[PDB]
Amino acid sequence: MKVPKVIKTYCPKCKTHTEHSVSLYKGGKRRSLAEGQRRYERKNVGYGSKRKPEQKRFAKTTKKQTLVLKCQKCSYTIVKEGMRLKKLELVE
RNA sequence: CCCGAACGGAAACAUCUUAGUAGGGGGAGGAAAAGAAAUCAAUUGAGAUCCCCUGAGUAGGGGCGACCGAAAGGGGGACAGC
RNA sequence: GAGGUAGAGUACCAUCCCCUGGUUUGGGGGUGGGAAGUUAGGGGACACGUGCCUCUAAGGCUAAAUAUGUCCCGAGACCGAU
RNA sequence: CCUUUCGUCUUGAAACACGGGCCGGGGAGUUCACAUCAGUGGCGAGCUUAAGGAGAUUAUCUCCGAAGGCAUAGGGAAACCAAGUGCCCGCAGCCUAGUUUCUAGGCGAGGGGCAGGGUCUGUCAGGGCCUGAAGCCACUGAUGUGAGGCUAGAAACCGGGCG
RNA sequence: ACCUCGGACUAGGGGCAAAAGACCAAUCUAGCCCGGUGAUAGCUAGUUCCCCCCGAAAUGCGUCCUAGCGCAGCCUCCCUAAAGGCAGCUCGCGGGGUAGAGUGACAGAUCGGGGGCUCCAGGCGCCUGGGGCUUCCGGUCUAACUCCGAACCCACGAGCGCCGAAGAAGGGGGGAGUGGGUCACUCGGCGUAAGGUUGGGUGGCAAAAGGGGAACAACCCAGACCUGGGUUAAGGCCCCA
RNA sequence: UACGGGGGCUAAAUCCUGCCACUGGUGGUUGGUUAAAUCCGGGUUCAACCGGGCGAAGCCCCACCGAAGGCCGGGGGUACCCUCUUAAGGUAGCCAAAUGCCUUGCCGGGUAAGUUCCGGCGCGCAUGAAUGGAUCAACGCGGUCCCUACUGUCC
RNA sequence: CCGCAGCCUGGCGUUGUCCCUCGGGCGUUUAUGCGUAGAGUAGGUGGGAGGGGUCGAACCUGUCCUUUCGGGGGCAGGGGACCCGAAAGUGAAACACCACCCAUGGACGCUCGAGGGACUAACCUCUCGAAAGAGAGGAACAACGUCAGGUGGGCGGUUCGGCUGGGGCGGCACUCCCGCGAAAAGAUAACACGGGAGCCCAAAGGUCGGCUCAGGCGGUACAGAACGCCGCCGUAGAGCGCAAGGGCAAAAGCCGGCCUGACGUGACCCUUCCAAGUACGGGGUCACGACGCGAAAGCGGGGCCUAGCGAACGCUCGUGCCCCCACACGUGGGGGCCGGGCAUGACAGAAAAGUUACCCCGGGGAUAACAGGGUCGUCGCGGGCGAGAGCUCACAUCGACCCCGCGGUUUGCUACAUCGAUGUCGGCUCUUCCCACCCUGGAGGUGCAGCUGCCUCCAAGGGUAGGGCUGCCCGCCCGUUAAAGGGGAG
RNA sequence: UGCCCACCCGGUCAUAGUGAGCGGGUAACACCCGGACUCGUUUCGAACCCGGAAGUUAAGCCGCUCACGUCAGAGGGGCCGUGGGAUCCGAGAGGGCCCGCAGCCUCUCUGAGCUGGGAUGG
Length: 92
Fold this sequence. Notes:
Blueprint: E1 9-11, E2 16-18, E3 20-24, H1 35-44, E4 64-71, E5 76-84
Antiparallel strand pairs: 1-2, 3-4, 4-5
This protein binds 7 RNA strands through strand 1, helix 1, strand 4 and strand 5.
Function: Binds to the 23S rRNA.
Subunit structure: Part of the 50S ribosomal subunit.
Keywords: Metal-binding, Ribonucleoprotein, Ribosomal protein, RNA-binding, rRNA-binding, Zinc, Zinc-finger
């Protein structure tokens, strides 16, 4: 697909339809020392089999594409619903 | 007091649990152990330890799965401290 | 009033391992470092700082209150010779 | 005169399926704890004493002992907030005169439907939950769950010894 | 590389094996005994007093699931609740594309003739044969065609009819088994077929004795409180009888 | 204490498993490099120090020598052609082998008949010379086939 | 799927002393600096108009080093005492003193490397020695401990999907969708049939406006059946993204204009999933708010409608706050919500390879193999009919294409019976049955001179061998005989 | 008066349609006049938009006739189902019969526009 860089949509803080910056969604860094991460080593310490099952088989060819819009007039950022696509082209 | 199991359970099973039990080794006594806080808790309080009833399946742990699982305080027993 | 004493590879720290709810927080050990020590230290749920509160280890030793039937008295909605 | 042999598995299969010589004796849904219900009783905005102590003809018994737990308010993670009333239909019973024999009408407990209120959430409608004042204890009972778990039945694996 | 005797040593996930997974005490794809341990069984067999009342399913969805379970439906028992409830029919009023029928009403399938137009081959401008196009006329089929279209089945209202305060629409609660069905008839599909399989509806049987069909789970008659009398059903009536 | 210690295939024995591309040497050269000694110039009041021409042998190069070391494939196509290692591409043998499908290749032996076996010829789908192919002396309670003698195995 | 031994490498400790070249440093020792304008070396910031001054300066004269030989910096004597300005320039001034930074070199005690070397006193190896102790070689290595990484079926535990007309192979009927199945309510099976999806579209989306298609006819240069143009007809025969079904004409089709509603938040409801429980997903109807389109009504939370998709846990993102302790407070760091993404196609979500013919266990006739029953595609046989050949003539005999029947001799399916056993091929012996008659008996026809033939019908009383090859059956063959029939009886 | 006759606004959505022929208009309705302004023609006043308005029943509109399409009625012909039941027939396929219902096609003939709300014309 093709999507323009700027889309006039509603801004919750601006309480009307405003211009926005549109870009793909990117996951953040794993951010070690998380509670869900801390227990991993505390569960991996000692002797035993691979404590947590890990996925090895993959079925879906692609992954869901998500749109991220930022509200220029108030620096707000909104999170949109995902969708399955080949590759979301950001060219206007 | 050291060493240290599998069986099963998770309807599979590997983390986990079954479990510091079964069992090994050492060493006593008629009881042993422990015993005088680097204890608690929290509006500035209590006052060794032990066991009994509660606190309580609460706190908290774990493919958050089966399950495991306190303490503090209160109530009893005798309450000895050098 | 003045002066003095008050326990080291011990606390504590990093790491690996063990276990217990102890979890970024517990205790033990191996390994490496490693203090202060009275004008000392520790502790008061992640770390650090600040104040406030309470204890003083790294040596002892200890009456009773409970664990049990190889045994001895007693009792029993325990059976009558497969 | 009419009549396939017991039990079980089983769509039927029982009669070519299994287990069945005879007799006698033995022999299999129990125990606890929790949860929940029923039935039963005691008390009641309380209930309930445990563990435990004292006295006693001594495990019986009597008194004492709320320790505690459940209910007595819910929402949400929290900071916190935090109700119990108001309409209507209407059973039994009662009252009214007829009782002609009675929904003829009222009163109407209970109950039902619209409400309302507290709470979080949503910017309002809303949405989720709670709220109309009764549970606790004791016995027996039943079922689920955990313990060998109705009875009996395996290859397995492990520890320690003995060849 | 003979054979054998007495002594001695090698221990089980080990020992030995001129090695067959052989032997190691009759126990060897991992020795024995005792203890974990009353291990694990979604499997297999048994499960014991009487009377009486009531009284099923073999289906759907999910499941490393089809030899079991969860949620349903189907049962029994209890309490509350207080006038309606509806397994049938009739009327009224709606829904339908199936049986059938049609193909010039689409989609396709498919047989022939006639007329005209066009091209080619042959023969003497003509004729014949063949090729393409059109028109007209005729016929043959459709689970995946429907211009039409029943019986029929279903919704709702009213009516009829039945049950109902002796024995009660709704609500709550305790306890289950049931998830392998089969056959007969009837309308399908698969397959020629099948006491085959797989669907819709009904009926038994399962759990239903009694009478007939010779005996018999299911075929017909017909639902066993008991004794007795009588009349009858499905069937039968020469003898067995 | 390596003619050893341990580990792996095998089972005795016998026989089959044209080329100078590189090096070495020899011979030579248009041509390039090449030490010591010597000449010239700068520079130094002379010496130390910088560049220019001559510079032997060896090396750079070519050809030959393989009873000099030694070497001597595969693929494409139809035993042969062709690029490269590096020059060519291993002759030869064996075979109805366990290899051959037409099958019982055909024929002969052996019997009345032989789907068994043996041997011979040659159509090699698809042998192509190494942990392979061929090979039987002696040996075997090994397996198959045939003959004699034998004989109640049979009729 | 993995885990643990062992092995290799490296780090740390047992780990000592001299060094040695270089590159790093540690705390020190010191000394070295011109874009232009200007008395002139302003390298860049500070306190600082005072700093030096028998608490020794200006002046010039040389020895000396260096440099962009610009020029400054260090030497005592000759000289016994003087210069910079708060004054002139510089986007930034004082060679007025003392500080910081960059930058060049050497050295001091310590550390690390590229490393290298040496020694012995650790320690190791061996010998002597009763002990004590001594001697010989390697060496701060090795070896051990510990940690990490690589390898690691040497050893240990495990799984080895599901559906299935036995199982495996086969395929996915295992996730969702169209029609048919399917029988005019709904629901309704098949490893039934014909098919699709794991997307694509910033425009293929919203709205407004305009035009009407496929196709055919007549006339015009190139001109053509079909490029364009002018007229006539054309009820969909086109087109609408992707399979099918349906729907659609001033449109949902085609062409332009403007847009981003393919909207945020909170809802109810349909299908999923009938009656009669339920995850997703899709879809519909809303309110609040703001948008966009059009004059407007109004229409727009995606595609004309029906397929285009993923729980817990954990991770990440956005969101405004909330919480972090047995004392409070501060900072950091964490935790929670609410929603989004990261996947599981075995698609209602374990992390998962083969053999066991050395197997073992509890079962299974809910189920394979031999053996009954049902059936008859095949097999054998029969009959109908009759193209054809036989000299003529279908039926003496052969009968093609077709059609209708029988048997349950093999062979195909069926799983009703048997899995706590109905012991499996052949053959031997022995008994019996049947007739679709091989011979023997009777009768007949004949393309029957006679024999030999060929064929039909009746007839099951009797007989129907012996050998070779092959285990058989089957099959080939030998020599006689009347021939050397075929089948049943678990 | 009137009512229907067209018109504007419709409902029914073909019995109301299509095609041809003819008839009707001095109002109504169109045809038709012209574009400077409004607006507008990826050329054009074609069309649309605006300003109009001579002529005119030829279009259209309207009525009528005839054809076809199409709804019904009747006739002829075509074709033929299904519920309910039986130890009825038939081996089966199938069929009859008693109890209840039908419809389908195709030719012939006969009809074939209805109606609400308002300003013109008779």
